[PDB]
Amino acid sequence: HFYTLNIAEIAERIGNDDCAYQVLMAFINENGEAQMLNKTAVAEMIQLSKPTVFATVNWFYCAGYIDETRVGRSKIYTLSDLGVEIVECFKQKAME
Amino acid sequence: DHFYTLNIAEIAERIGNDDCAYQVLMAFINENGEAQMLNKTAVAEMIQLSKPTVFATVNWFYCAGYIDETRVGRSKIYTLSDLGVEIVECFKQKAMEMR
């Protein structure tokens, strides 16, 4: 069961969500490369209510934006191929 | 442009494991199994969960692309996007094959 979707419009929507945009963008180091993060570290990068930032990371998971990997004791998140593609819109939208 | 292919199965199970998400999704399917439309308030009312909680989900469901929003009179009303209908028609099937 696949579904093939115009990413550009979701990327628009997220891009209109103050809180969502920042949580996606965290996963991008200054070198323009994606990076792994746990929920705590993200919570720190962004000045916003730790609750809301945890809640945002959670749905991002759901939605399929960020992959989760079990590391020893804690859970660590990276962007999905989808997360990367959404960032790739933003990358190009800032460009032009 | 920017097209991308989701696995709907993978998104479904993820949603299936969130009590609030599942219910918010399913609220757009009526008694007769047809898809319907609601505003934020009507969703909140069907779900037996913190109105705040329901509102955050309806928000992010919108971001995710599961629902679209249509202006009417003096009321932003929500309806499943095609994606949202994908996600349901997937739950519907897992339940279908079950019985």
Q: What is the resolution of the experimental data for this entry, in Å?
A: 2.8
Could you give phi then psi for residue B6, rounded to 5 degrees?
-85, 150
Fold category of A1-96 in CATH:
Arc Repressor Mutant, subunit A (1.10.10)
Does residue A62 contact residue B18 with C-beta atoms inside 8 Å?
Answer: yes
Structure determined by: X-ray
Record: contact B14-A88, CB cut-off 8 A: no
Amino acid identity of A69?
A: T
**Residue A8 contacts B, CB cutoff 8 Å:** yes
CATH number of B1-99: 1.10.10.10
- Torsion angle, alpha carbons of B41, B11, B62, B40, to 10: 0
Which residues in chain A touch residue B63, judged by CB atoms under 8 angstroms apart?
10, 13-14, 17, 20, 59, 63
User: What is each CA distance from B26 to A73, B3, B5, B29, B40, in whole angstroms?
Assistant: 34, 26, 23, 6, 14
Amino acid identity of A94?
A: A
